[PDB]
Every structure is written in structure tokens, then in C-alpha cells.
């Protein structure tokens, strides 16, 4: 098992995946976990889609929550895999949080800001703007990359990271949704 959180690259109390070297803060895993698991635990990237080996102690699994409208159980797992894959990629750091409100030009130019913290929240059924289809998830990810390409100079580090991470994402999308075209 690795020494730093797969998502935020910091230390502290870290939950180890039983199947890959990745370790996570409870709140950095997607979905965030409400407690430390007592027994076998496998992360979202390793968990089998068909036969789920364990349900998670997360917000969407609470009794009052799983009746609410939202993604199907199948689409929830697929979209969580897509979003956690984004968050664990080294290139993703500039997209974890919204751009600082001090960035005068950024917010003059980008009219529909998007970042991975918003996407994480909308995967939760209790969010007022919760996703109901995988198309909405894919649309927000693609909006995030479009904003990056719109604002940043093409030769900049962040512009390059955005373009390269988007290529990785579209590859994962075809892996996870081989039969669904999001055109």
C-alpha cells in the first residue's frame, strides 16, 4: 500500500484497499465513506460492477436516501469509477477545487464554472442538483475541460494537463461504457 492518499496526496489516517496499492482518506474516496470499514474493503476502482463485494457506508446507502431519484445502482458505480479515476490522476489537481474568486479574468470569461468538487457532490442523491443520468455526469466533465481550454493559454501547464487528462477520461469512458455513445 502507498503512503499518501490517492486523491489529495497527503498523509494522515488512510484506509487501504484490499486489492490495489491505493490508500484513501475516508472523505477523499468516491463515494465518501462515513466510517472506517470493519472488514474486507475494496475501493471503487477495484470493486466489481456485476457482483458487488461490499456495499459502502456512504450517504447514498442510507435508508432514507436510496429511495430518492438518481442514478441507477449500475450507473452510480460506473460514474463513481469515472470520477474517482479523474481524481486519482496526477494531472487532476488544478480541477479538484473551484478557481480562486480572486481570479478576475477567469470569472469574467468562464460563465459556467465546473470542478471535481461539484461533480462529487452531484453524485450524491441529497444534492439539490443531483445527477439522474450518466449523460449529465459526462456533460459536466466535458464542460470542465472546455472551460480549461477556453481560459488557459494553449501552451500553459494547466492547458496541457486539461487536454491530456481529457484524453485519459475519454479512454476510460469507452472502457466503462463500451456500448453507449455520449455524442
Amino acid at each position: 500500500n502507498e503512503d499518501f492518499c490517492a486523491v489529495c496526496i497527503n498523509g494522515g489516517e488512510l484506509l487501504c484497499c484490499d486489492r490495489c496499492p491505493k490508500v484513501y482518506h475516508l472523505s477523499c474516496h468516491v463515494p465518501a465513506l462515513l466510517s472506517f470499514p470493519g472488514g474486507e474493503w475494496v475501493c471503487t476502482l477495484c470493486r466489481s460492477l456485476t457482483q458487488p463485494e461490499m456495499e459502502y457506508d456512504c450517504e447514498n446507502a442510507r435508508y432514507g436516501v436510496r429511495v430518492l431519484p438518481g442514478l441507477s445502482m449500475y450507473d452510480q458505480k460506473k460514474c463513481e469509477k469515472l470520477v474517482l479515476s479523474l481524481c486519482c490522476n496526477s494531472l487532476s489537481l488544478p480541477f479538484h477545487e473551484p478557481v480562486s474568486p480572486l481570479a478576475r479574468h477567469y470569472y469574467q470569461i468562464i460563465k459556467r464554472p465546473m470542478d471535481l468538487s461539484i461533480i462529487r457532490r452531484k453524485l450524491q442523491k441529497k444534492d439539490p442538483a443531483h445527477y439522474t443520468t450518466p449523460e449529465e455526469v459526462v456533460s459536466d466533465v466535458r464542460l470542465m475541460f472546455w472551460n480549461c481550454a477556453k481560459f488557459n493559454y494553449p501552451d500553459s501547464e494547466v492547458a496541457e494537463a486539461g487536454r491530456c487528462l481529457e484524453v485519459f477520461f475519454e479512454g476510460w469512458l469507452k472502457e466503462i461504457y463500451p456500448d453507449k455513445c455520449f455524442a
Binding site: 498523509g11 484490499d18 490508500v23
Partner: peptide, 10 residues
């Protein structure tokens, strides 16, 4: 359920 502790560090 293994956990570890690591020293914490546009």
C-alpha cells in the same frame, strides 16, 4: 480494513 498513518506534508 487495514489503515495506516503517514506524516502529513493558474
Amino acid at each position: 480494513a487495514r489503515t495506516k498513518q503517514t506524516a502529513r506534508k493558474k
